[PDB]
């Protein structure tokens, strides 16, 4: 009577006790993936029998099955109720097609809130203090270069304290960035978002809401980009946004690469409109801009925002806990994405 | 008539109104420095006349005069009452010889507390996240290197949250480091210092005191060095300290370079005792260690701790205000260092 769960890719690596418990409550079936076409044929032939859930324990696990298109989804068994996956993004998945077949989806939203906010704070520190340029000077091992750059940095460096952070988006990650920047570093906060923060959150952060991106640009010393990536957010930060910013201002991005136009950013740095910028995410990722690399004051990292052991622990906790709640406890998912359906026990 | 003030190096750069006020109240004399030996000869020949104060508006200004040793000091005019200087902790000054001549000294203590504590927080984030290595991979411009290093960092990177910060020293700068690390990032605090923290510092930070440096080393996930540099703190962090640390731990330094033994640090990274380290200050400054440069996980900066325009505004305000108070207002110095003297 144990419900049956298809495992896409490797078993758990972080949470050993929880994974042992999961394998007693549920019959776990390894997919043994080879290719996308091979997986479609295994489904058509009912190789795995009727199953009620699918689990995917890491971002890099089960990529042999990609893409999850409408064609593949049409061969899933009629018994299927829920699919839970590691990560925030799901580009490999046609979610509308999955929901049309009556299947509930959960991502692992919230798992990397601490990691991604800390990394944004690192970038904010870097662009105010010009620390990226300082590191490259130190790494020459040349004494005169050390002294020259020590002096040069003092002409342009500032403390965050007392300066205005402009939040593009005020979701959970940005709420942590703001708490750390306001109470920790002593910055002031303005924000732009489709829905207002509640009176309590606004009071706790001293957050003032503005009505347009232009108003946000006009008031910021440093802009923090943290929004979901969709068609509506492609090149959200464009030539017109940079034109509205203050001379000698700064920008950071931990969201998705194309949210900021790479060419508009380069032009704003070349003209002196921006003093500095920090990108963890890149328009043509994994190709970093050679033009940005060759400049003095652009901080560049390898999409490490959520890359911390604690995030990966929480990916395993959330995926197992979602399926346990939904099929055994009669309780709703913690982190649904797309359409919501009724639980069972 | 107006008291006379010797200017060491460049005039003011930030506080134009306060500097114009200063030049009205006081006759300001440019030192016109060439070399140290040439300055001693100028003082011997009475080239500047009798003056009542000396001012030094920036840490990098007036360095041609160094050192302010006993021989140089012996030729200062007996009219001299006060010397105010930017920065704090000065290896270039014989403070006991200056006070022997009845001359009061002020540094600019406190001006850089925000800047130095923020730069220490940057190094703490760097050593936990392996961000220094990530930057170097990004700057290759090679797509395969980008993907490979993204995966590699996931094997070793951790959130500071819930880990222990071990403070060596709990003075003004470290109290701000700890406030930001504990309340902001979610770390826990253990400390060593020569004196107990006030009951309010301890309650606010959840601070646990230990009795020795080996006890502090053993308890820590990341050590933060912030103490005054003097004979008794030379090589404070040595082979025995690193032996006491846990496998895979981390250390940062924003104090002075020789507080940590360069050779001991190199050895502890080579063996795997330390995962990562962050240095703003260097034992043989301005030469940074070539052995540390050639490794994966050592974060290295050009002594930028206090380098922020707001620090420099406060250096100019404190130096000018100190001299005005002490020579014209009959008021004590705001930031004395060494012996205290009665104002005119």
XYZ file of C-alpha atoms in Angstrom:
689
model
C 0.000 0.000 0.000
C 3.161 2.192 0.149
C 2.889 4.863 -2.596
C 5.441 4.470 -5.467
C 8.033 7.210 -6.330
C 10.236 7.450 -9.485
C 13.802 8.662 -8.659
C 15.317 10.820 -11.459
C 19.104 10.455 -11.225
C 21.276 9.958 -8.118
C 20.030 9.198 -4.542
C 20.455 11.656 -1.632
C 23.969 12.822 -0.643
C 23.413 15.105 2.365
C 20.498 13.926 4.559
C 21.100 10.232 5.349
C 18.547 9.709 8.167
C 15.754 11.530 6.275
C 16.437 9.535 3.073
C 16.354 6.200 5.036
C 12.963 7.223 6.510
C 11.707 8.214 2.988
C 12.598 4.728 1.605
C 10.529 2.990 4.352
C 7.425 5.190 3.819
C 7.620 4.933 -0.012
C 8.645 2.391 -2.673
C 11.459 4.249 -4.517
C 12.106 3.130 -8.157
C 15.397 4.165 -9.920
C 14.801 5.543 -13.460
C 18.158 4.143 -14.769
C 18.208 6.866 -17.448
C 20.119 6.508 -20.714
C 18.666 9.013 -23.242
C 15.553 11.199 -23.721
C 14.180 8.889 -26.431
C 14.935 5.790 -24.331
C 12.965 7.287 -21.362
C 9.925 8.042 -23.576
C 9.940 4.395 -24.782
C 10.218 3.052 -21.205
C 7.089 5.111 -20.264
C 5.118 3.848 -23.325
C 5.992 0.242 -22.411
C 4.947 0.738 -18.730
C 8.463 -0.350 -17.658
C 8.182 1.252 -14.161
C 4.497 0.332 -13.446
C 2.002 2.899 -12.030
C 3.729 5.533 -9.823
C 2.228 8.466 -7.820
C 5.230 10.829 -7.527
C 8.561 11.842 -9.121
C 11.545 13.172 -7.060
C 14.660 15.032 -8.372
C 17.254 15.616 -5.631
C 19.727 18.052 -7.309
C 19.823 20.546 -10.200
C 22.416 18.514 -12.161
C 20.588 15.157 -11.594
C 18.486 13.477 -14.344
C 19.495 15.750 -17.217
C 19.430 12.718 -19.590
C 15.618 12.971 -19.541
C 15.528 16.560 -20.849
C 13.404 18.147 -22.202
C 10.185 17.596 -20.222
C 8.089 18.617 -23.258
C 4.375 17.986 -23.938
C 5.384 14.927 -26.006
C 7.159 13.161 -23.114
C 4.507 14.258 -20.573
C 1.743 12.569 -22.658
C 3.233 9.128 -21.793
C 3.201 9.480 -17.955
C 0.960 6.997 -16.052
C -2.610 8.088 -15.087
C -1.745 7.411 -11.389
C 0.693 10.369 -11.192
C -0.188 13.123 -8.663
C 2.993 15.169 -7.801
C 6.591 16.042 -9.042
C 9.016 17.723 -6.548
C 12.416 19.129 -7.676
C 15.603 20.759 -6.329
C 16.379 24.350 -7.477
C 14.366 27.528 -8.041
C 14.350 27.494 -11.872
C 12.704 24.925 -14.183
C 13.568 25.949 -17.821
C 13.682 22.265 -18.845
C 9.935 21.848 -17.953
C 6.656 22.675 -19.751
C 4.699 23.417 -16.524
C 1.418 24.291 -18.306
C 1.487 20.868 -20.078
C 2.218 19.061 -16.754
C -0.696 20.913 -15.009
C -3.077 20.153 -17.947
C -2.469 16.426 -17.231
C -3.580 17.052 -13.599
C -0.065 16.791 -12.024
C 1.025 19.151 -9.142
C 4.547 20.642 -9.196
C 6.809 21.879 -6.347
C 10.191 23.588 -6.806
C 12.541 24.269 -3.826
C 11.780 28.015 -3.380
C 13.415 29.546 -0.259
C 16.251 26.948 0.088
C 19.026 29.437 -0.844
C 17.629 32.661 0.776
C 20.635 32.970 3.182
C 23.315 32.141 0.530
C 21.971 34.382 -2.244
C 21.405 37.388 0.090
C 24.936 37.050 1.570
C 26.441 36.953 -1.922
C 24.488 40.111 -2.910
C 25.871 41.816 0.252
C 29.447 40.836 -0.821
C 28.792 42.488 -4.244
C 27.404 45.672 -2.580
C 30.539 45.913 -0.386
C 32.769 45.306 -3.506
C 31.197 48.090 -5.661
C 31.284 50.749 -2.855
C 34.919 49.932 -1.806
C 36.452 49.010 -5.228
C 37.764 45.761 -3.702
C 37.916 43.757 -6.975
C 40.491 46.233 -8.438
C 42.465 46.176 -5.132
C 42.711 42.329 -5.268
C 44.166 42.368 -8.804
C 46.777 44.963 -7.712
C 47.788 42.923 -4.665
C 48.199 39.790 -6.876
C 50.898 41.458 -9.041
C 53.347 41.125 -6.105
C 54.850 44.476 -7.248
C 55.442 47.013 -4.381
C 54.963 50.182 -6.453
C 51.665 48.876 -7.910
C 50.461 48.165 -4.314
C 51.124 51.810 -3.280
C 49.740 53.383 -6.511
C 46.406 51.504 -6.383
C 46.045 52.031 -2.534
C 46.094 55.776 -3.329
C 43.907 55.627 -6.468
C 41.076 53.815 -4.639
C 40.843 56.645 -2.000
C 39.753 59.077 -4.770
C 36.486 57.066 -5.391
C 35.646 54.689 -2.427
C 32.669 55.321 -0.008
C 31.001 53.616 3.058
C 27.476 52.198 2.327
C 26.272 53.825 5.639
C 23.779 56.675 4.964
C 23.491 55.915 1.205
C 20.245 54.766 -0.518
C 19.794 51.118 -1.671
C 17.212 50.770 -4.464
C 15.465 47.365 -4.417
C 14.106 46.217 -7.851
C 11.779 43.512 -6.473
C 11.010 42.953 -2.731
C 10.571 39.143 -2.490
C 12.094 36.889 0.215
C 15.724 37.079 -1.022
C 15.593 40.897 -1.337
C 13.978 41.176 2.156
C 17.102 39.479 3.615
C 19.448 41.698 1.476
C 17.641 44.782 2.856
C 17.652 43.593 6.517
C 21.451 43.105 6.281
C 22.130 46.343 4.381
C 19.843 48.549 6.575
C 20.422 47.223 10.125
C 23.927 45.805 9.495
C 25.564 48.374 7.160
C 23.326 51.402 7.965
C 21.919 52.049 4.426
C 18.484 53.641 3.689
C 15.910 51.755 1.545
C 13.531 52.559 -1.360
C 11.711 49.811 -3.337
C 9.719 49.055 -6.538
C 7.429 45.964 -6.741
C 4.049 44.881 -8.195
C 2.621 44.307 -4.692
C 3.254 46.360 -1.550
C 5.159 44.958 1.392
C 2.887 44.833 4.444
C 2.828 47.723 6.950
C 4.878 45.592 9.396
C 7.691 44.706 6.926
C 7.767 48.298 5.682
C 8.131 49.528 9.301
C 10.816 46.961 10.230
C 13.039 47.873 7.236
C 12.087 51.565 7.021
C 11.113 50.754 3.415
C 9.593 53.513 1.270
C 7.674 52.395 -1.856
C 8.135 54.317 -5.194
C 5.730 54.211 -8.236
C 8.067 53.733 -11.268
C 11.534 52.412 -12.271
C 12.479 56.002 -13.200
C 11.765 57.182 -9.620
C 13.826 54.252 -8.297
C 16.846 55.100 -10.529
C 16.665 58.842 -9.609
C 16.880 58.121 -5.846
C 19.501 55.258 -5.671
C 23.240 55.229 -4.849
C 23.277 51.448 -5.463
C 20.556 49.377 -7.261
C 19.978 45.669 -6.258
C 18.225 43.546 -8.937
C 16.261 40.537 -7.480
C 13.181 39.522 -9.593
C 11.764 36.359 -11.287
C 12.989 35.977 -14.898
C 10.178 36.027 -17.479
C 9.447 37.715 -20.837
C 8.300 40.810 -18.900
C 11.690 41.040 -17.091
C 13.956 40.496 -20.189
C 16.112 43.668 -20.457
C 14.057 45.266 -17.612
C 17.185 47.318 -16.871
C 17.919 49.019 -20.218
C 19.425 52.222 -21.788
C 16.491 54.298 -20.427
C 17.068 53.052 -16.829
C 20.796 53.954 -16.936
C 19.941 57.398 -18.344
C 17.792 58.030 -15.247
C 20.506 56.978 -12.716
C 22.741 59.432 -10.726
C 26.269 60.165 -12.006
C 28.861 57.936 -10.332
C 26.256 55.366 -9.189
C 26.461 51.527 -8.806
C 24.442 48.320 -9.660
C 24.436 44.589 -8.620
C 22.614 41.525 -10.080
C 21.998 38.121 -8.470
C 18.776 37.314 -10.396
C 19.204 36.170 -14.040
C 21.780 37.454 -16.586
C 19.441 38.844 -19.300
C 17.466 40.989 -16.743
C 20.195 43.635 -17.341
C 21.175 44.474 -20.973
C 24.946 43.715 -21.281
C 25.415 46.373 -24.007
C 23.540 49.088 -22.056
C 25.659 48.313 -18.954
C 28.993 48.511 -20.882
C 27.956 51.904 -22.406
C 27.046 53.337 -18.969
C 30.459 52.337 -17.551
C 32.379 53.720 -20.569
C 30.676 57.148 -20.153
C 31.196 57.433 -16.365
C 27.442 57.286 -15.581
C 28.216 54.179 -13.471
C 31.364 54.133 -11.303
C 31.182 50.349 -10.730
C 29.072 47.180 -11.171
C 28.843 43.619 -9.773
C 27.431 40.599 -11.698
C 27.013 37.037 -10.373
C 24.757 36.325 -13.444
C 25.621 37.025 -17.155
C 23.556 37.767 -20.327
C 25.384 35.087 -22.418
C 26.293 32.742 -19.502
C 28.611 30.729 -19.402
C 30.395 33.299 -21.639
C 31.470 36.272 -19.450
C 31.918 39.642 -21.284
C 35.562 40.256 -22.358
C 34.789 44.006 -22.491
C 33.659 43.913 -18.816
C 36.725 41.834 -17.843
C 39.183 44.387 -19.367
C 37.816 47.293 -17.196
C 38.952 48.454 -13.726
C 35.778 48.284 -11.622
C 33.509 45.408 -12.628
C 33.190 42.583 -10.054
C 32.478 39.224 -11.809
C 31.634 35.823 -10.201
C 30.653 32.312 -11.531
C 26.904 32.232 -10.607
C 27.748 31.233 -6.971
C 24.714 33.031 -5.387
C 23.034 29.877 -3.973
C 26.189 27.691 -3.998
C 26.583 26.693 -0.316
C 26.362 23.250 1.353
C 23.356 24.424 3.504
C 21.301 25.230 0.339
C 21.815 21.632 -0.898
C 20.669 20.225 2.487
C 17.479 22.281 2.189
C 16.895 21.054 -1.457
C 16.836 17.458 -0.048
C 14.662 18.404 2.981
C 12.075 20.281 0.879
C 11.692 17.659 -1.899
C 11.141 14.727 0.558
C 8.931 16.762 2.913
C 6.670 18.024 0.058
C 5.893 14.444 -1.120
C 5.407 13.158 2.492
C 2.908 15.989 3.277
C 0.957 15.678 -0.016
C 0.561 11.843 -0.174
C 0.669 10.657 3.489
C -0.363 13.537 5.830
C -3.264 15.115 3.895
C -1.463 18.488 3.924
C -0.735 21.022 1.134
C 2.729 21.462 -0.483
C 5.137 23.954 1.192
C 6.455 25.303 -2.121
C 3.959 24.826 -5.000
C 4.718 26.356 -8.433
C 1.874 26.638 -10.983
C -1.585 25.179 -10.319
C -2.555 23.906 -6.808
C -4.396 20.553 -6.317
C -5.902 18.662 -3.299
C -3.706 16.553 -0.973
C -4.330 12.957 0.230
C -3.515 10.776 3.293
C 49.031 87.668 17.089
C 47.854 84.426 15.448
C 49.473 81.135 16.584
C 51.634 79.492 13.878
C 51.052 75.917 12.460
C 53.536 73.774 10.436
C 51.718 71.860 7.598
C 53.198 68.406 6.808
C 52.434 67.684 3.150
C 49.268 68.570 1.167
C 46.532 71.048 2.392
C 42.860 70.018 2.915
C 40.911 68.120 0.176
C 37.404 67.624 1.654
C 36.366 70.278 4.207
C 36.896 73.538 2.283
C 34.858 75.828 4.683
C 36.542 74.479 7.862
C 40.006 74.820 6.185
C 39.346 78.490 5.208
C 38.303 79.145 8.870
C 41.535 77.434 10.067
C 43.731 79.625 7.785
C 42.039 82.790 9.182
C 42.612 81.839 12.868
C 46.195 80.450 12.357
C 49.284 81.338 10.224
C 49.779 78.047 8.248
C 53.393 77.336 7.151
C 54.088 74.742 4.339
C 56.995 72.385 5.344
C 57.954 72.042 1.638
C 59.469 68.605 2.348
C 62.372 67.090 0.319
C 64.094 64.327 2.409
C 64.149 63.334 6.106
C 67.782 64.442 6.614
C 66.998 67.742 4.808
C 64.039 68.383 7.239
C 66.268 67.801 10.294
C 68.713 70.363 8.854
C 65.861 72.868 8.283
C 64.789 72.554 11.946
C 68.428 72.916 13.117
C 68.758 76.190 11.087
C 65.389 77.538 12.452
C 64.074 77.827 8.830
C 60.358 77.884 9.868
C 60.759 80.174 12.979
C 58.943 79.436 16.290
C 55.627 77.525 15.769
C 52.992 76.344 18.312
C 51.395 73.392 16.447
C 51.918 70.779 13.708
C 49.056 69.333 11.503
C 49.059 66.217 9.216
C 45.756 65.889 7.261
C 46.159 62.390 5.730
C 47.968 59.106 6.489
C 49.870 59.308 3.174
C 50.889 63.008 3.647
C 54.306 64.091 4.943
C 56.008 60.664 4.685
C 59.297 62.271 3.470
C 59.762 63.430 7.105
C 59.833 59.891 8.641
C 60.985 58.757 11.144
C 60.061 61.257 13.873
C 62.954 59.885 15.971
C 64.713 61.355 19.054
C 67.318 63.217 16.879
C 64.646 64.957 14.711
C 62.521 65.827 17.805
C 65.552 67.376 19.601
C 65.523 70.254 17.049
C 61.832 71.290 17.349
C 61.253 74.845 18.731
C 60.433 75.057 22.499
C 57.292 77.113 21.589
C 55.672 73.867 20.287
C 52.531 72.807 22.277
C 50.581 70.241 20.136
C 50.754 67.827 17.115
C 47.473 66.409 15.593
C 47.642 63.639 12.901
C 45.337 61.555 10.678
C 44.988 57.771 11.372
C 45.931 55.741 14.466
C 48.827 53.484 15.521
C 52.018 55.101 14.237
C 55.217 53.114 13.831
C 56.949 56.351 12.637
C 56.729 58.374 15.933
C 58.842 58.295 19.145
C 55.915 59.360 21.378
C 57.864 59.293 24.669
C 60.517 61.682 23.233
C 57.768 64.117 22.059
C 55.983 64.139 25.468
C 59.385 64.726 27.230
C 59.495 68.136 25.443
C 56.059 69.035 26.874
C 54.280 68.468 23.504
C 50.714 67.006 23.526
C 49.754 64.478 20.797
C 46.389 63.532 19.224
C 45.636 60.834 16.656
C 42.240 60.511 14.867
C 40.954 57.421 16.801
C 37.457 56.265 15.739
C 37.338 57.971 12.291
C 37.722 54.685 10.346
C 35.571 52.331 12.567
C 32.798 51.926 9.933
C 35.207 51.428 6.969
C 37.570 48.921 8.713
C 34.699 46.790 10.159
C 32.907 46.661 6.724
C 36.185 45.526 5.000
C 36.619 42.760 7.632
C 33.003 41.619 6.904
C 33.915 41.458 3.156
C 36.930 39.165 3.924
C 34.690 36.933 6.196
C 32.177 36.510 3.344
C 35.084 35.817 0.898
C 36.692 33.008 2.996
C 33.355 31.211 3.683
C 32.149 31.395 0.005
C 35.497 30.989 -1.900
C 34.610 34.167 -3.875
C 38.223 35.156 -4.630
C 38.735 31.882 -6.588
C 35.359 32.378 -8.337
C 36.401 35.901 -9.547
C 39.664 34.563 -11.086
C 37.739 31.795 -12.934
C 35.203 34.331 -14.315
C 38.017 36.585 -15.575
C 39.520 33.816 -17.797
C 36.553 34.356 -20.163
C 36.532 30.564 -20.781
C 33.045 28.852 -20.657
C 34.403 25.438 -19.592
C 36.396 26.996 -16.702
C 33.169 28.843 -15.635
C 31.111 25.622 -15.350
C 33.896 23.587 -13.730
C 34.625 26.113 -10.935
C 30.869 26.633 -10.271
C 30.663 22.899 -9.411
C 34.006 22.719 -7.528
C 33.025 25.567 -5.096
C 29.860 23.640 -4.075
C 32.059 20.943 -2.457
C 33.542 23.355 0.155
C 31.514 26.599 0.465
C 29.394 27.297 3.661
C 26.967 30.018 4.990
C 28.531 31.975 7.926
C 25.100 31.518 9.673
C 25.321 29.312 12.827
C 29.150 29.050 12.730
C 31.491 30.544 15.373
C 33.410 33.813 14.888
C 36.483 33.836 17.184
C 37.480 37.420 18.026
C 41.120 38.063 18.986
C 40.607 41.461 20.672
C 37.174 43.056 21.391
C 37.873 46.803 21.029
C 35.874 49.423 19.097
C 36.413 48.060 15.538
C 35.798 44.410 16.594
C 32.537 45.340 18.413
C 31.268 46.564 14.999
C 32.649 43.484 13.156
C 30.771 41.285 15.740
C 27.510 43.300 15.606
C 27.405 42.906 11.792
C 28.459 39.195 11.825
C 26.087 38.149 14.708
C 22.925 40.210 14.060
C 23.370 40.527 10.248
C 24.838 37.141 9.139
C 23.679 34.968 12.082
C 27.076 33.900 13.480
C 27.811 33.067 17.174
C 30.578 34.945 19.106
C 33.489 33.638 21.282
C 36.296 36.069 22.311
C 39.714 36.612 23.909
C 40.756 40.050 25.285
C 43.020 41.514 27.974
C 39.927 43.057 29.669
C 36.327 41.797 30.034
C 33.669 43.288 27.756
C 31.179 45.566 29.483
C 28.019 43.792 30.683
C 26.034 45.473 27.873
C 28.398 44.431 25.043
C 28.234 40.827 26.321
C 24.415 40.767 26.493
C 23.931 42.429 23.066
C 26.323 40.077 21.198
C 25.733 36.874 23.165
C 29.520 36.955 23.759
C 31.276 34.031 25.526
C 34.758 34.888 26.956
C 37.633 32.345 27.040
C 40.911 32.611 29.038
C 43.599 31.824 26.414
C 44.454 32.138 22.676
C 44.679 28.320 22.234
C 41.124 28.000 23.702
C 39.906 30.670 21.231
C 41.629 28.926 18.259
C 39.999 25.542 19.065
C 36.422 26.948 19.324
C 36.420 28.928 16.021
C 35.164 28.348 12.448
C 36.626 31.734 11.388
C 39.146 33.803 13.457
C 39.085 37.678 13.224
C 42.359 39.468 14.210
C 41.824 43.066 15.541
C 44.372 44.195 18.209
C 46.917 47.062 18.563
C 50.370 46.266 17.046
C 53.244 46.484 19.578
C 56.167 44.348 20.837
C 53.853 41.958 22.741
C 51.601 41.333 19.689
C 54.440 40.601 17.145
C 53.773 37.067 15.795
C 50.813 36.736 18.276
C 49.326 34.252 15.756
C 52.046 31.603 15.260
C 52.696 27.847 14.700
C 51.082 26.875 18.086
C 47.921 28.896 17.345
C 47.396 27.179 13.962
C 48.095 23.746 15.557
C 45.165 24.472 17.934
C 42.698 25.384 15.109
C 40.180 22.862 13.745
C 40.782 21.122 10.363
C 39.284 23.116 7.456
C 39.026 26.435 9.388
C 39.533 30.078 8.223
C 41.309 33.333 9.324
C 41.149 37.101 8.447
C 43.456 40.040 9.442
C 42.645 43.797 9.346
C 45.084 44.846 12.135
C 48.798 45.048 11.158
C 50.759 42.594 8.928
C 53.324 41.230 11.466
C 50.581 40.210 13.986
C 50.441 36.912 11.962
C 53.654 34.978 11.079
C 53.731 34.735 7.224
C 55.720 31.467 7.244
C 53.366 29.779 9.777
C 50.297 30.877 7.729
C 51.809 29.459 4.465
C 52.514 26.103 6.187
C 48.989 25.766 7.640
C 47.430 26.364 4.194
C 49.890 23.908 2.510
C 48.916 21.131 4.994
C 45.123 21.626 4.688
C 44.744 22.790 8.316
C 43.257 26.003 6.896
C 40.776 25.959 3.975
C 41.053 29.698 3.273
C 42.456 33.043 4.567
C 41.935 36.822 3.971
C 44.667 39.484 4.468
C 44.247 43.282 4.072
C 47.632 43.773 5.852
C 50.965 42.028 5.039
C 54.076 41.101 7.107
C 56.526 42.677 4.540
C 54.138 45.368 3.219
C 54.231 46.695 0.468
C 55.468 43.264 -0.870
C 52.634 40.731 -0.811
C 53.650 37.033 -0.372
C 54.318 35.302 -3.727
C 53.652 31.916 -2.054
C 50.151 33.075 -0.947
C 49.415 34.550 -4.413
C 50.091 31.175 -6.106
C 47.353 29.353 -4.077
C 43.612 28.855 -4.771
C 41.908 30.311 -1.702
C 43.847 33.313 -0.263
C 42.025 36.700 -0.506
C 44.544 39.601 -0.734
C 43.824 43.412 -0.684
C 46.086 46.581 -0.767
C 45.590 47.776 2.916
C 42.201 49.367 2.055
C 40.557 48.805 5.514
C 40.132 52.500 6.389
C 40.137 53.809 2.783
C 36.743 55.567 2.293
C 35.936 59.266 1.647
C 33.890 59.471 4.958
C 37.015 58.391 6.912
C 38.996 61.244 5.278
C 36.256 63.844 6.116
C 36.581 62.806 9.782
C 40.477 62.913 9.693
C 40.245 66.582 8.482
C 37.523 67.501 11.070
C 39.372 65.906 14.066
C 42.857 67.350 13.265
C 41.568 70.948 12.750
C 39.124 70.857 15.727
C 41.731 69.385 18.117
C 44.201 72.263 17.469
C 41.447 74.979 17.649
C 40.149 73.624 21.008
C 43.664 73.259 22.551
C 45.254 76.597 21.412
C 42.261 79.015 21.210
C 39.315 77.693 23.335
C 41.035 76.497 26.573
C 39.466 73.033 25.969
C 40.994 69.483 26.142
C 41.799 67.349 23.049
C 39.016 65.021 21.776
C 41.431 62.168 20.864
C 44.635 62.329 22.945
C 47.288 59.614 22.719
C 50.111 59.371 25.266
C 50.480 61.953 28.081
C 47.656 64.483 28.712
C 48.501 68.213 29.134
C 46.562 71.308 30.315
C 45.403 73.631 27.461
C 46.583 77.283 27.247
